[PDB]
Amino acid sequence: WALEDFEIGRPLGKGKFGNVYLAREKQSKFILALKVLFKAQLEKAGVEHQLRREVEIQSHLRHPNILRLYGYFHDATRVYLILEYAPLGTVYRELQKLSKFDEQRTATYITELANALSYCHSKRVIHRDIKPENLLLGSAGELKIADFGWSVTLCGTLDYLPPEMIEDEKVDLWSLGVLCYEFLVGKPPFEANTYQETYKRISRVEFTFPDFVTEGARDLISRLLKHNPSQRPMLREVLEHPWITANSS
Ligand SMILES: CO[C@@H](C(=O)N1Cc2[nH]nc(NC(=O)c3ccc(N4CCN(C)CC4)cc3)c2C1)c1ccccc1
C-alpha cells in the first residue's frame, strides 16, 4: 500500500499530529478518509510506539459502530491511516446544533456505543474515556467511535474523566453515564465554573437532573455514574435497561 493508490480531495480537519483529508482509492473508485500523522510530531508526544499499538488493535476491529480502519502505511516523515468516511460529522456538532437530544436519539446512541464496546470487551479490548468530539456519524445516522484510544495537561478532558482517573473496562461505563447525561441535558454532569470546582464535583459525584430528565433516564445515569467502578453495571445490563429498550432501537 502507498500514497499513489489514492486520489486526494478536500481537507477534513486537523489533528494532534497532522491533517486528515477525504480521499478516493484509485483501483476501486472508493471514498474514504486519509489521515496524515507526522512522525516527528509523534516522536515529540511520546506516542510514536503507542500509536503503533492502537493501530494494531483497531485494525482487527470490524463493527458498524466503530470507525473502520481499512489499512495504514508509512514513509519519510509521516504516517497514513486508511479510514472509513463518516459523512454526517461528529456527535459533538449535531449536539452543538440541537442543544440537546431527545430521549430516543439518546437511548439509541447509548445502545450503539454499548454494542461496540461489547464487541471489544469480547476481544480483550478496552476503551479509555469517551468524548462527543470523538464520535462520528455514518450515512445512516449511525454513531462511530473514532478516537484511537483502544487497549488490550490536555484540554477539555476533565469533564469526561471518571473518579479513579483523577484521584480497566469500567471507565467506558462512566463515559456512558456522562455521555448519556450530556446527550439529554446539553452539558456534562460535573461541568463547573472553575477547574478546582469541576474536580470536586467529579470526585464527590455531585450532579443534579434538570426538571425534564425523565425518571427512567435518571435510573441509568445514576447506576453508571458510580464512584465505585465495581458497582458500575455490565454492558449487558445497560443494554437491557428498561429505559434503554423503551426509547432505543
Ligand atoms: C482528527 O481525526 C479525525 C479522523 O480521523 N476522521 C476520520 C474520518 N472519516 N470521516 C470523517 N469525517 C469528518 O470528519 C466529517 C466532518 C464534517 C462533516 N460535515 C459537517 C456537519 N454536517 C452536518 C455534515 C458534514 C462530515 C464529515 C473523519 C474524521 C477526527 C475528527 C473528528 C472526530 C474524530 C476523528
Please indicate whether residue 87, judged by its CB atom, sits closer than 6 Å to ligand 1.
yes
14-20: long-range pairs with CB below 8 Å, 24+: 16/41, 16/45, 17/41, 17/42, 17/45, 17/47, 18/78, 18/79, 20/83
How many C-beta neighbours within 10 Å does residue 204 have? 11
Please indicate whether residue 12, judged by its CB atom, sits closer than 6 Å to ligand 1.
yes
From the candidates 5, 129, 159, 219, give the one annotated as an active-site residue. Answer: 129
Q: Which fold has domain 90-248?
A: Transferase(Phosphotransferase); domain 1 (1.10.510)
Atom of ligand 1 nearest to the CA of 86: 10
Query: Is 211 noted as a catalytic residue in this protein?
Result: no
Counting Cβ atoms within 10 Å, is residue 215 exposed (0-12), middle (13-18) or buried (19+)? exposed
Residue 76, CB-side half-sphere exposure with 13 Å CA sphere: 1
3-state secondary structure of 51: helix
Domain locations along the chain = 1-89, 90-248
Helix 103-121 / helix 171-185 crossing angle, nearest 10 deg: 170
- Cβ atoms of residues 61 and 150 within 8 Å: yes
3-state secondary structure of 204: helix
User: CA–CA separation, 36 vs 146, rounded Å?
Assistant: 15
Instruction: Compute CA distances 85 → 31, 33, 138, 225, whole Å.
Output: 7, 5, 8, 32
* Closest among 198, 245, 200 to 219, alpha carbons compared: 245
**Binding site members for ATP:** 16, 35, 84-86, 133-134, 147
Q: Say which experimental method was used.
A: X-ray
How many C-beta neighbours within 10 Å does residue 191 have? 16
Q: How many residues does the chain have?
A: 249
Residue with cell 478496552: 126
User: CA–CA separation, 187 vs 195, rounded Å?
Assistant: 16
Please indicate whether residue 88, judged by its CB atom, sits closer than 6 Å to ligand 1.
yes
* Closest among 119, 110, 100 to 180, alpha carbons compared: 110
Using the mean position of ligand 1's atoms as its centre, give its distance from the Cα of residue 15 in Å: 11
User: CA–CA separation, 205 vs 5, rounded Å?
Assistant: 51
How many C-beta neighbours within 10 Å does residue 229 have? 15
Task: Specify the CATH number of the domain 1-89.
Answer: 3.30.200.20
- Cβ atoms of residues 103 and 146 within 8 Å: no
Using the mean position of ligand 1's atoms as its centre, give its distance from the Cα of residue 184 in Å: 23
